[PDB]
Scaffold this motif. Structure first.
Motif, mmCIF file in Angstrom:
data_model
loop_
_atom_site.group_PDB
_atom_site.id
_atom_site.type_symbol
_atom_site.label_atom_id
_atom_site.label_comp_id
_atom_site.label_asym_id
_atom_site.label_seq_id
_atom_site.Cartn_x
_atom_site.Cartn_y
_atom_site.Cartn_z
ATOM 1 N N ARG A 12 -17.167 27.419 -12.924
ATOM 2 C CA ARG A 12 -18.414 26.160 -12.364
ATOM 3 C C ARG A 12 -19.170 25.974 -13.232
ATOM 4 O O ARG A 12 -19.958 25.098 -13.181
ATOM 5 N N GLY A 13 -19.724 26.811 -14.276
ATOM 6 C CA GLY A 13 -20.677 26.678 -15.033
ATOM 7 C C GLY A 13 -20.045 26.873 -16.598
ATOM 8 O O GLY A 13 -19.026 27.306 -16.865
ATOM 9 N N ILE A 14 -21.023 25.999 -17.576
ATOM 10 C CA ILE A 14 -20.568 25.778 -18.728
ATOM 11 C C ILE A 14 -21.779 25.669 -19.720
ATOM 12 O O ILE A 14 -22.528 24.902 -19.056
ATOM 13 N N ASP A 15 -22.079 25.870 -20.821
ATOM 14 C CA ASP A 15 -23.031 26.014 -21.549
ATOM 15 C C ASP A 15 -22.885 25.884 -23.114
ATOM 16 O O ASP A 15 -21.840 26.498 -23.528
ATOM 17 N N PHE A 16 -23.492 25.450 -23.831
ATOM 18 C CA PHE A 16 -23.446 25.661 -25.516
ATOM 19 C C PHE A 16 -24.229 26.457 -26.004
ATOM 20 O O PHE A 16 -25.317 26.764 -25.328
ATOM 21 N N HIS A 17 -23.946 27.561 -26.711
ATOM 22 C CA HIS A 17 -24.440 28.607 -27.435
ATOM 23 C C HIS A 17 -24.654 28.317 -28.731
ATOM 24 O O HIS A 17 -24.058 29.046 -29.561
ATOM 25 N N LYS A 18 -25.619 27.467 -29.065
ATOM 26 C CA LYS A 18 -25.609 26.676 -30.342
ATOM 27 C C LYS A 18 -26.475 27.652 -31.599
ATOM 28 O O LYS A 18 -26.760 26.948 -32.765
ATOM 29 N N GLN A 19 -27.115 28.600 -31.485
ATOM 30 C CA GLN A 19 -27.988 29.495 -32.213
ATOM 31 C C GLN A 19 -27.296 30.145 -33.158
ATOM 32 O O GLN A 19 -27.913 30.126 -34.499
ATOM 33 N N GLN A 20 -26.193 30.271 -33.195
ATOM 34 C CA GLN A 20 -24.986 30.522 -33.980
ATOM 35 C C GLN A 20 -23.819 29.897 -33.396
ATOM 36 O O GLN A 20 -23.669 29.915 -32.278
ATOM 37 N N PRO A 21 -22.830 29.781 -34.143
ATOM 38 C CA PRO A 21 -21.661 28.374 -33.631
ATOM 39 C C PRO A 21 -20.906 28.946 -32.704
ATOM 40 O O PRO A 21 -19.826 29.493 -33.021
ATOM 41 N N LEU A 22 -21.389 28.690 -31.199
ATOM 42 C CA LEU A 22 -20.493 29.493 -30.312
ATOM 43 C C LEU A 22 -20.919 28.343 -29.048
ATOM 44 O O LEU A 22 -21.771 27.720 -29.002
ATOM 45 N N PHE A 23 -19.945 28.328 -28.079
ATOM 46 C CA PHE A 23 -20.209 28.218 -26.419
ATOM 47 C C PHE A 23 -20.039 29.162 -25.727
ATOM 48 O O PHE A 23 -19.471 30.137 -26.161
ATOM 49 N N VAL A 24 -20.601 29.288 -24.643
ATOM 50 C CA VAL A 24 -20.821 30.180 -23.503
ATOM 51 C C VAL A 24 -20.271 29.573 -22.177
ATOM 52 O O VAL A 24 -20.462 28.435 -22.141
ATOM 53 N N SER A 25 -19.618 30.158 -21.433
ATOM 54 C CA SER A 25 -18.795 29.699 -20.122
ATOM 55 C C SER A 25 -19.343 30.771 -19.198
ATOM 56 O O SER A 25 -19.526 32.015 -19.501
ATOM 57 N N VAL A 75 -18.520 34.640 -23.633
ATOM 58 C CA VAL A 75 -18.847 33.905 -24.940
ATOM 59 C C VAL A 75 -17.716 33.709 -25.736
ATOM 60 O O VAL A 75 -16.873 34.657 -25.473
ATOM 61 N N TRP A 76 -17.554 32.551 -26.279
ATOM 62 C CA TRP A 76 -16.573 32.170 -26.962
ATOM 63 C C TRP A 76 -16.834 31.325 -28.359
ATOM 64 O O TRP A 76 -17.861 30.836 -28.487
ATOM 65 N N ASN A 77 -15.762 31.713 -29.270
ATOM 66 C CA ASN A 77 -15.818 30.919 -30.717
ATOM 67 C C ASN A 77 -15.091 29.728 -30.498
ATOM 68 O O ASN A 77 -14.057 29.718 -29.851
ATOM 69 N N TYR A 78 -15.804 28.787 -30.951
ATOM 70 C CA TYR A 78 -15.023 27.368 -31.225
ATOM 71 C C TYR A 78 -14.321 27.280 -32.598
ATOM 72 O O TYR A 78 -13.614 26.282 -32.703
ATOM 73 N N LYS A 79 -14.480 28.068 -33.639
ATOM 74 C CA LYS A 79 -14.030 28.208 -35.217
ATOM 75 C C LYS A 79 -12.918 29.202 -35.227
ATOM 76 O O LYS A 79 -12.032 28.881 -36.303
ATOM 77 N N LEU A 80 -12.750 30.057 -34.400
ATOM 78 C CA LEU A 80 -11.889 30.941 -34.872
ATOM 79 C C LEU A 80 -11.077 31.404 -33.649
ATOM 80 O O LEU A 80 -10.138 32.238 -33.523
ATOM 81 N N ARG A 81 -11.402 30.595 -32.491
ATOM 82 C CA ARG A 81 -10.951 30.860 -30.911
ATOM 83 C C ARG A 81 -10.442 32.225 -30.560
ATOM 84 O O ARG A 81 -9.429 32.609 -30.752
ATOM 85 N N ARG A 82 -11.708 33.035 -30.490
ATOM 86 C CA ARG A 82 -11.467 34.305 -30.037
ATOM 87 C C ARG A 82 -12.674 34.406 -29.209
ATOM 88 O O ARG A 82 -13.553 33.794 -29.052
ATOM 89 N N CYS A 83 -12.628 35.659 -28.141
ATOM 90 C CA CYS A 83 -13.733 35.979 -27.327
ATOM 91 C C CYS A 83 -14.588 36.954 -28.280
ATOM 92 O O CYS A 83 -14.246 37.761 -28.351
ATOM 93 N N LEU A 84 -15.951 36.305 -28.458
ATOM 94 C CA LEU A 84 -16.582 36.881 -29.024
ATOM 95 C C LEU A 84 -17.310 38.173 -28.367
ATOM 96 O O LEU A 84 -17.551 39.269 -28.681
ATOM 97 N N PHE A 85 -17.727 38.164 -26.972
ATOM 98 C CA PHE A 85 -18.307 38.938 -26.136
ATOM 99 C C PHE A 85 -18.587 38.663 -24.517
ATOM 100 O O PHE A 85 -17.912 37.450 -24.259
ATOM 101 N N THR A 86 -18.142 39.665 -23.943
ATOM 102 C CA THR A 86 -18.016 39.449 -22.319
ATOM 103 C C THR A 86 -19.034 40.276 -21.809
ATOM 104 O O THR A 86 -19.348 41.502 -22.207
ATOM 105 N N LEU A 87 -19.542 39.721 -20.539
ATOM 106 C CA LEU A 87 -20.625 40.486 -19.881
ATOM 107 C C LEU A 87 -20.697 39.899 -18.534
ATOM 108 O O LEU A 87 -20.052 39.085 -18.173
ATOM 109 N N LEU A 88 -21.161 41.127 -17.632
ATOM 110 C CA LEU A 88 -21.107 41.313 -16.393
ATOM 111 C C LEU A 88 -22.328 40.349 -15.951
ATOM 112 O O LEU A 88 -23.508 40.582 -16.340
#
Lengths: 135, 133, 813, 813
Positions: free
Chosen positions: C55-68, C77-90
């Motif tokens: 339901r929620g979606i955001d850009f995390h552009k401080q370093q080149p990433l998107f957050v969902s 947190v997700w990579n748009y250049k490497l298509r991998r999950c950078l980090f996962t949090l509760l």
């Protein structure tokens, strides 16, 4: 070499298993087999058909093509004869042609290819001969 | 311009119209050479009535304008604008009168190079009933 | 409204606009998230991050990433250049409705439908803060362009303004030591459910689903479950500033402000998207796009486009301008309004931009026009095409509305349009929607004048007062008459030299640069129509035709000066610089260099010594220095560059001295060159040089032919032997004839086995003995007399010249 | 694992597992991913570790497999050594009692031309020096030869090791099984030995002896191999006029056209050729031998002609065979083509004899009459045959059946003046039952020209003149026709004069005569009455009237050149007509240079900035049909670097998924959001992508018909002819000016070009460039040309339309 590659194809658009006698046709093997064997090697139900300046000899088995390719040639009888002997050897390994079962016996088929055609020169094989190797 | 369309699917009629009009006006408004080149191709692969039309028109075209005679000769010797069937018979006549004969006849014959009949304006009434059918 | 982008994805619960780039993220109910380059049309990413609604979606552009954030109850947190999950949090223990990213350290905020919004620090082990207050779902959390504050919209009938660095919110009374929150009746009634209160905001419309800001305003608008939208002040919590917009029919999912228009754009879960008046706060108009319900909205914080998410997919839609009119003075771009407000000047390859005060436009542009001396700007205002409006003139170097109201500069007066025209201070105006002329009486003209009228054409924009009804019509200075009309093919632009007396018009190849009225001075050479190009008043023409800024010409030279990394339009050339602005209107500037320009200014004035220094690797290319200089039929340029074995070959035939040719021909490793230069050699006159060439191309027989012609007999014999072996019967054969005796043939022919031919040749010279040898070795019968003699004297006096033509005299120039 | 390129982590796990099957499967999975061409070195230590010494053949065979297709590349578990992990414990493998492991090892080891395995392959011939099978001895001669190939052309590979080192090739000849890997560069003594072996052959082995040494003195000596060479050798000893009667060529030859009619058609051709070598005039082409199946004794039983009758065809076998067969009847027997075409035509053309050769479709019937009749026009003898057969054609006595018949015969009379007097009376008969134009036209012409001969005419004409059917074209034909030949030589109740009266009324006048004519108003608009009305100077009499015209033939009329002819037999011609016979800031500057025919895009990459751009990489891209032949390769674009970097260019490729614009050029540098930037070098167009192809007049004509080309533009600078600007420009939008569509004279003579291309755009491209160059007092627009253009949906039509104007680019850096 006179015989570039000896190749088993699926007309899924890819070379299912194939043999490069000496490092030359790696990736090249897949593109040739994938395009040409789909059209029946561009054949009309003729064992010799030549396309893109490469001689393709073939036999259809299901959605699959057993393919011999050459771009040079020493004799008429010979090209068919290695393909033919190959066609005795291939159902022993894979029970006709079929992509999944061909895939599983990459080693079997590939080894036969090296044994059958060595440095592009058509040696001979037989199902008993094949046994000593995979023993 | 319209003749540029489609070589033989354009029909007997359009070729007959550019042909009849190019024959009759005898273009000095545009060079007749485009017209002639366009008609020349159409004749080959289209019906007898137009190919016959094309020789006779050419003959009248000769009589009205002197200039034109050289094109008439390249066209008529061809297996097309002459020497087909109907096209031949008309052509043998039309040609022989232009080529051979005095052209008293040819001259007389062109009064502008007009159509074969002048009716009323047929289209408009036809169109009136035809549209909400 | 124009539809830039529209991709059917199915139910998009979350939508967010990237603040760095012109991108959109959508989180779908299908559990897929997608990142789109909506301008480029290229799918950046696609992830199925959860089975159910995300339901929620955001850009995390401080370093080149998107957050969902998804209903996995996590912020990922997700990579748009490497298509991998950078980090996962509760994030929480329920649906993550909206997620927002802190720019402090890689902290992530998640707003959830379990009544809290929390901020979590990955970089360390800490969960730094949890922000609580809601009693029912925080549907949305939204950033302002400052990172200190956020707003949350919740369905407990409030909007809570939070601090993210703060524990919940941050405030302390200076009039008391006590906590701001009171659980008792004070001057307002609320519970104890906060640590302290900085700002508790109304959201009452039976709960607000979303809240969002205008990029340059503290004001926020919220859409709520009912059928209203309510606009709030989040900076004071006032209830004397809050107006309700009514139009929608069912639960409003969101309402956000349009950055680039003075309207508020809302969307609701009915079937309509409604557009609201932002100076009246009620529905101007309703649109149905029949994609049904809308569950998310978005307004671009990069002030690009605008977007709203629906239950079929999303649309990013356009309310922007394309190809605006502009002019450059010395360091000032003046352009007609585009998104991202006013910008321009500086940079040269970046898509960033920065501000300078050079606004030609500072109010709705009816007209924007330069003075022809370039000292004033005319901006026509209050729109209309009736017979009146207002026009405000600004000073060109730094622009205000009025400079001072007590000074002649920056005045305004009435006139439907006013546009400057030549005599270089004058203007012509429409104030009855006729052509009226404007004076002020000395200086750049600011004051409205009613005399002089026409009855043709209709007021609009220009730079010489352009008016249209069927053509682009230039109008006179002090006459009502049409000065001239232009009709031509355009690429949506009108190009001025910089002085607005003159005009450049685009044609089928390139552009033509013309003077006042329509008079063509020259045509720019270039195959395709340029986007824009401008002339530094004349001479140095710099233009854009792609992604690079190149000069059509400077002093007969031709250069590509440099490339930028973006497509662009030249703003104009005033000074050494050329200034550019594109559709989005980001600037590039470029200094006209003494690179390509000096080199050919020098080569033209036959200087090669100057030109060697000039040769640099910013202009070397392959054929403008090292092989363009092999393009003189009396070598000059050619002499200088000769480094290529081919250029050397070429040089030689162009002089006619092939001494150099043979060597180039050698170094070209090729026979053909030796025979062709040898032929040229025979042309300069001397056959020694020809022999050598011709010998090694193996044209011994051509040589054999040449040789009595040349008058050598010694050399002629050498050819005969080395052509004997080839059995060239029009090589070996020749030479015997050419010397007074024929014996040479007799042996060669014997070796050929041509005994007959050998006898006839020999016999005639009176060498009957050799002739007989041939007969005896082979088949005899020598008696026979052919259609030619078989025994009649052959003797020729060979070459009376003592010095031969291998020794042909020469001086050479 | 069909092709799965990421699976290498699982393979390592599977490669050693304590279960032999799993290890085999793993190693197998590696093989299949490499063969397709995918990732493999990660695994190497694991792969190598289980298998190494063992005599257990299957894993060993598998590892042995992987060493001939990638050994060199993979190095984790192998590295580089003389006795690598390919062969160190495979000296054991070579020296196992089981022939299979040794044999296999020998076979891969010697197969490599590897220099890091040169020593281990040399005594690897030990493994097969003992020959337990035919396979072992063959494996050995091929392995010694492969050793010889691998850098041992001298003494390391030439003598014996203990029995072979280049001597299996000798041994094989005298041993029970043959196979000679000795094809090139090997022992002379073995070559000699193979000759001896021709006699004591082993058949597979004979094909190996035979590729090396061919030509026998014998007939044979046995076996397919010898037999296959033998037909080659036979063709030598009798080349003369093809093989004629195909030798052992016949066996492969049938399969060469297995699809299925084409074999018979071909076979029929050879059989016809073989019969005889005739005169070889126009379609009398039979080569091969003059007598070898003769033609035509009168004592020969059951004769040659029985086979000749097959070739005369209506379709008597199927259509492919039919087209071949009609040509083949013509080819063995005729005078040219004419004789056998008349016989053949008599069978095909419409009659009352057989109703399996008549049909009520008028054009085919008509065409068949014209084909029969063209034979007469060709050759005289045929006139006499044709006219009575034509009367039989008439006797059908359908309105239409008569009609077609009358139409050709009337043309024949124009050729054949007062020779066909006899036909007129037959021709009238079916003229009365009438529902068509054609019957009236033709009949009125025969009856008209023929009047002297007959006297019937008021009676015959009059039933039709008052009967109805379709009458447009009837007018034209009757107009020139009705009076003709002899002034008063008829009479039934209307003499020849009544006919002239009639003839005039039918043309356009009015007169009671033949109970009035059917219509009077003429056919197509140009024709009118008037010429003929003026005419009949001397009333229907051979003089200088209609009669003259009628008894004369317009221009040349001879042969089958289509001058009163139609060119063979009408059905065969349709097939022949069908046969078309088609044949991070970055700065760039750039120019294109050519030196020694190397075409390169020169680029200079410039960092005007002080900032860091390290991480600098340069790439030229493949967009679609554009491609890099080698990108610029320097690591340049550093702080204040000027560099010249050359990117080689190609124009011809296959479409890539990335953008399709001008030229993409990519420079990389420092930055993490826009690590890669796209910036431009000078113009390249969309037009490149088109692919040039050509048409002939037939293909052009077919395509004209196929799809519309009405679309025209007039292009300036088509003042010039086809050859000059127009060809060069047309070339660049991959087009070519081929065949004409013009009609030149003293009034005509626009230059016409037929264009073709076959664009990689899903369309073809065609156009006609008409150059309006004045050949009249009133030109179109003077010099300029109008290009009438198309493409298959006219999306490339437009490219042709504007890329024939101008086109030029240059720079001079």
């Amino acid at each position: 070499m006179v015989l570039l590659a000896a190749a088993v194809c699926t007309k899924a658009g890819k070379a299912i298993v194939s043999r490069q006698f000496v490092e030359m046709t790696r990736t090249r093997i897949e593109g040739l087999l994938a395009a040409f064997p789909k059209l029946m090697n561009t054949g009309k139900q003729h064992t010799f058909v030549e396309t893109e300046s490469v001689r393709y000899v073939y036999q259809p088995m299901e959605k699959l093509y057993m393919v011999l390719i050459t771009t040079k040639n020493s004799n008429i009888l010979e090209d068919l004869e290695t393909l033919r002997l190959f066609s005795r050897v291939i159902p022993e390994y894979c029970r006709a042609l079929e992509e999944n079962e061909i895939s599983e016996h990459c080693f079997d088929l590939i080894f036969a290819f090296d044994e059958i055609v060595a440095l592009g020169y058509r040696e001979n094989v037989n199902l008993a001969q094949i046994r000593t190797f995979t023993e | 311009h319209l003749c540029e369309f489609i070589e033989d699917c354009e029909f007997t009629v359009l070729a007959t119209r550019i042909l009849h009009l190019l024959g009759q006006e005898g273009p000095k408004t545009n060079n007749p050479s485009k017209y002639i080149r366009f008609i020349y191709n159409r004749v080959v692969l289209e019906h007898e009535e137009v190919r016959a039309g094309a020789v006779s028109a050419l003959a009248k075209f000769g009589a009205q304008n002197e200039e034109m005679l050289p094109s008439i000769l390249v066209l008529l010797k061809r297996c097309v604008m002459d020497d087909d069937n109907e096209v031949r018979d008309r052509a043998t006549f039309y040609l022989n009168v232009l080529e051979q004969k005095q052209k008293a006849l040819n001259a007389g014959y062109i009064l502008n190079g007009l159509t074969v009949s002048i009716p009323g304006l047929e289209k408009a009434l036809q169109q009136y009933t035809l549209e909400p059918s | 409204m124009l539809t830039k982008f529209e991709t059917k994805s199915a139910r998009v619960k979350g939508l967010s606009f990237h603040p760095k780039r012109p991108w959109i993220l959508t989180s779908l109910h299908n559990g897929v998230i997608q990142l789109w380059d909506y301008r480029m049309c290229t799918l950046i990413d696609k992830f199925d991050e959860h089975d159910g609604p995300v339901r929620g979606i955001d850009f995390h552009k401080q370093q080149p990433l998107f957050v969902s954030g998804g209903d996995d109850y996590k912020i990922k947190v997700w990579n748009y250049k490497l298509r991998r999950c950078l980090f996962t949090l509760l994030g929480h223990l329920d649906y993550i409705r909206t997620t927002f990213f802190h720019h402090e350290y890689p902290w992530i905020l998640s707003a959830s439908d379990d009544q809290t919004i929390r901020v979590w620090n990955w970089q360390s082990r800490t969960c730094v803060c949890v922000l609580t207050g809601h009693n029912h779902y925080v549907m949305c959390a939204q950033f302002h362009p400052s990172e200190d504050l956020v707003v949350s919209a919740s369905l407990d009938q409030t909007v809570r303004v939070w601090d993210i660095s703060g524990l919940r919110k941050k405030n302390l009374s200076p009039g008391a030591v006590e906590s701001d929150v009171r659980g008792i009746t004070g001057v307002d009634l609320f519970g104890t459910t906060d640590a302290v209160v900085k700002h508790v905001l109304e959201g009452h419309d039976r709960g607000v689903n979303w809240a969002a800001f205008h990029p340059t305003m503290p004001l926020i608008v919220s859409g709520a479950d009912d059928r209203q939208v309510k606009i709030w002040r989040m900076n004071e919590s006032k209830a004397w500033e809050v107006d309700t917009c009514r139009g929608h029919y069912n639960n409003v999912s969101c309402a956000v402000f349009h950055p680039r228009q003075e309207l508020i754009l809302s969307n609701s879960e009915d079937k309509s998207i409604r557009v609201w008046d932002m100076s009246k706060r009620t529905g101007v108009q309703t649109f149905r796009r029949d994609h049904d319900r809308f569950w998310v909205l978005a307004a671009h914080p990069n002030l690009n486009l605008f977007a709203a998410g629906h239950d079929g997919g999303m649309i990013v839609f356009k309310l922007e301008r394309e190809r605006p009119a502009y002019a450059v003075h010395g360091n000032m771009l003046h352009y007609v309004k585009d998104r991202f407000l006013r910008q321009l000047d500086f940079n040269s390859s970046k898509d960033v931009a920065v501000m300078q005060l050079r606004s030609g436009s500072k109010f709705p542009v009816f007209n924007m026009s330069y003075n022809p001396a370039e000292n004033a700007v005319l901006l026509c205002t209050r729109a209309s095409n009736l017979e009146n409006s207002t026009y405000d003139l600004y000073t060109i170097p730094k622009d205000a509305d009025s400079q001072n109201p007590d000074a002649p500069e920056g005045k305004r007066s009435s006139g439907l349009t006013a546009v400057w025209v030549a005599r270089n201070r004058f203007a012509v105006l429409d104030r009855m929607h006729s052509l009226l002329i404007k004076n002020l009486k000395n200086e750049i003209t600011k004051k409205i004048q009613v005399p002089n009228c026409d009855e043709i054409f209709y007021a609009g924009t220009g730079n010489l007062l352009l008016r249209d009804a069927d053509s682009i019509t230039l109008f006179d200075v002090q006459q009502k008459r049409t000065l001239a009309s232009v009709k031509i093919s355009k690429v949506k632009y009108v190009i001025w030299s910089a002085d607005m007396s003159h005009v450049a018009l685009l044609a089928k190849h390139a552009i033509v640069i013309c003077n006042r009225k329509l008079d063509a001075l020259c045509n720019i050479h270039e195959n395709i129509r340029v986007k824009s190009g401008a002339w530094d008043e004349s001479g140095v023409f710099i233009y854009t035709t792609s992604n690079h800024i190149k000069y059509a010409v400077t002093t007969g030279d031709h250069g590509i000066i440099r490339t930028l990394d973006l497509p662009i339009y030249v703003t104009r050339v005033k000074g050494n610089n050329v200034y550019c602005l594109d559709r989005e209107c980001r600037p590039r500037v470029l200094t006209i260099d003494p690179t390509e320009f000096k080199f050919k200014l020098a080569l033209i004035n036959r200087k090669y010594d100057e030109v060697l220094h000039m040769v640099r690797n910013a202009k070397l290319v392959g054929q403008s220095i090292i092989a363009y200089l092999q393009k003189k039929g009396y070598p000059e340029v050619a002499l200088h560059f000769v480094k290529d074995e081919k250029t050397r070959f070429s040089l030689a035939l162009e002089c006619g001295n092939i001494e150099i040719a043979l060597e180039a021909a050698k170094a070209l490793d090729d026979k053909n060159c030796w025979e062709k230069l040898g032929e040229v050699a025979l042309l300069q006159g001397n056959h020694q040089i020809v022999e050598m060439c011709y010998q090694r191309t193996k044209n011994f027989d051509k040589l054999s032919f040449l040789y009595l012609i040349t008058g050598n007999l010694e050399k002629l014999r050498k050819m005969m032997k080395i052509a004997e072996i080839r059995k060239d019967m029009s090589g070996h054969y020749q030479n015997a004839l050419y010397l007074g005796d024929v014996s040479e043939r007799v042996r060669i022919l014997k070796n050929c086995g041509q005994k007959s031919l050998a006898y006839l040749s020999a016999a005639t010279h009176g060498l009957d003995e050799e002739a007989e040898s041939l007969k005896e070795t082979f088949d005899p019968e020598k008696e026979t007399i052919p259609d030619i003699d078989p025994n009649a004297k052959l003797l020729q006096p060979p070459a009376p010249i003592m010095p031969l033509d291998t020794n042909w005299p020469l001086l050479t120039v | 694992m069909d092709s799965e390129p990421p699976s290498e982590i699982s393979l390592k796990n599977d490669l050693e597992k304590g279960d032999v099957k799993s290890k085999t499967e793993a190693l197998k999975k590696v093989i299949i991913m490499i063969l397709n061409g995918e990732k493999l070195p990660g695994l190497l230590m694991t792969i190598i570790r289980f298998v190494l010494p063992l005599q257990d053949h299957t894993i060993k065979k598998l590892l042995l497999v992987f060493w001939e297709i990638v050994p060199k590349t993979t190095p984790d578990g192998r590295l580089l050594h003389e006795m690598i992990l390919v062969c160190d414990a495979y000296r054991k493998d070579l020296q196992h009692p089981n022939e299979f492991i040794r044999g296999s090892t020998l076979r891969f080891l010697c197969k490599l031309k590897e220099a890091e395995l040169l020593e281990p392959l040399m005594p690897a011939i030990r493994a097969c020096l003992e020959h337990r099978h035919s396979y072992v001895r063959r494996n050995a001669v091929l392995a010694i030869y492969t050793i010889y190939r691998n850098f041992e052309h001298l003494i390391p590979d030439a003598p014996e090791l203990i029995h072979d080192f280049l001597v299996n090739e000798k041994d094989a000849s005298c041993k029970r099984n043959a196979f000679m890997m000795l094809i090139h560069a090997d022992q002379d003594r073995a070559l000699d030995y193979l000759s001896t072996c021709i006699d004591q052959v082993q058949t597979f082995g004979d094909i190996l002896q035979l590729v090396i040494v061919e030509l026998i003195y014998k007939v044979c000596h046995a076996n397919p191999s010898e037999r296959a060479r033998f037909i080659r050798c036979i063709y030598n000893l009798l080349q003369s006029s093809s093989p004629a009667v195909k030798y052992e060529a016949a066996g492969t030859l049938v399969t060469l056209s297995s699809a299925p009619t084409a074999i018979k058609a071909a076979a029929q051709c050879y059989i016809d050729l073989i019969i005889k070598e005739s005169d070889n005039n126009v379609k009398l082409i039979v080569l091969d031998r003059l007598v070898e199946l003769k033609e035509h004794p009168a004592h020969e039983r059951v004769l040659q002609d029985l086979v000749m009758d097959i070739l005369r065809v209506l379709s008597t076998p199927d259509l492919e065979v039919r087209k071949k067969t009609l040509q083949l009847a013509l080819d063995l027997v005729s005078s040219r083509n004419v004789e056998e075409l008349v016989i053949v035509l008599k069978k095909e053309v419409i009659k009352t004899n057989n109703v399996s050769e008549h049909e009520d479709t008028d054009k085919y019937r008509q065409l068949l009459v014209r084909t029969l009749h063209s034979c007469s026009v060709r050759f005289p003898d045929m006139a006499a045959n044709v006219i009575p057969v034509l009367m039989e054609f008439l006797s059908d006595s359908n309105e239409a059946a008569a009609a077609d018949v009358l139409e050709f015969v009337r043309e024949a009379i124009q050729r054949f003046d007062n020779l066909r007097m006899l036909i007129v009376e037959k021709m009238l008969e079916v003229f009365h039952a009438i529902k068509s134009v054609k019957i009236y036209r033709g009949a009125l012409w025969i009856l008209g020209e023929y009047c002297s001969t007959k006297e019937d005419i008021q009676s015959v004409m009059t039933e039709v003149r008052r009967s109805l059917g379709e009458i447009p074209i009837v007018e034209s034909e009757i107009k020139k026709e009705a009076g003709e030949l002899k002034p008063e030589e008829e009479i039934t109740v209307g003499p020849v004069q009544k006919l002239v009266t009639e003839m005039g009324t039918y043309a356009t006048q009015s007169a009671l005569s033949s109970s009035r004519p059917t219509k009077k108003e003429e056919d197509r608009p140009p024709l009118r009455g008037f010429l003929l009305d003026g005419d009949f100077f001397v009333a229907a009499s051979l003089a200088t009237t209609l009669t003259k015209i009628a008894l004369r033939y317009v221009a040349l009329v001879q042969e089958k050149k289509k001058q009163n002819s139609f060119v063979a037999e009408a059905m065969l011609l349709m097939a022949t007509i069908l046969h078309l016979g088609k044949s991070d800031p970055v700065y760039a500057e750039a120019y294109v240079h050519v030196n020694q025919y190397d075409i390169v895009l020169d680029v200079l990459v410039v960092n005007q900035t002080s900032d860091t751009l390290q991480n600098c990489t340069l790439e030229l891209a493949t967009l679609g049909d554009l491609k890099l032949v080698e990108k610029p390769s320097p690591l340049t674009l550093a702080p204040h670097d000027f560099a010249n970097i050359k990117a080689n260019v190609k124009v011809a490729s296959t479409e890539n998924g990335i953008i399709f614009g001008n030229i993409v050029y990519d420079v990389s540098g420092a930055a993490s959001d826009r690590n890669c930037v796209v910036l431009s070098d000078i113009h390249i167009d969309i037009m490149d992508y088109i692919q040039p192809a050509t048409c002939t007049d037939a293909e052009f004509r077919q395509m004209w018909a196929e799809f519309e080309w009405e679309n025209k533009v007039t292009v300036n600078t088509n003042m010039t002819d086809l050859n000059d600007y127009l060809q060069h420009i047309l070339k660049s939008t991959n087009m070519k000016c081929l065949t004409p569509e013009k009609a030149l004279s003293g009034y005509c003579g626009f230059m016409a070009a037929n264009l073709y291309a076959r664009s990689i755009f899903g369309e073809d491209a065609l156009a006609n460039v008409s150059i309006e160059k004045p050949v009249h007092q009133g030109p179109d627009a003077a010099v300029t040309g109008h290009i009438r253009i198309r493409a298959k949906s006219q999306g490339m039509a437009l490219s042709l339309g504007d890329k024939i104007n101008l086109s030029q680019k240059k720079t001079s850096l």
